Amino acid sequence: FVNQHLCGSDLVEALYLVCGERGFFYTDPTGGGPRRGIVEQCCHSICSLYQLENYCN
DSSP, rough: OOSSSTTTTHHHHHHHHHHHHHHHSSTTTTTSSSSSHHHHHHHHSSHEEEEEEESBB
16 A cells, blocks of 8 residues: 555555545446546556545545
8 A cells, every 4th residue: 555556446445544434435436437536546646645535534
């Protein structure tokens, strides 16, 4: 969970630590064009936990 790219469930298991007990919401359920701000950001690019901490609660 350092300089690796998160994509799909990978992100979830990752936000889980970032948000921890704070709980969080995944991007839109559309899956065809959800909040590309979370998936592509960390999937298309290596985002740090910081950004993931942006969607935590």
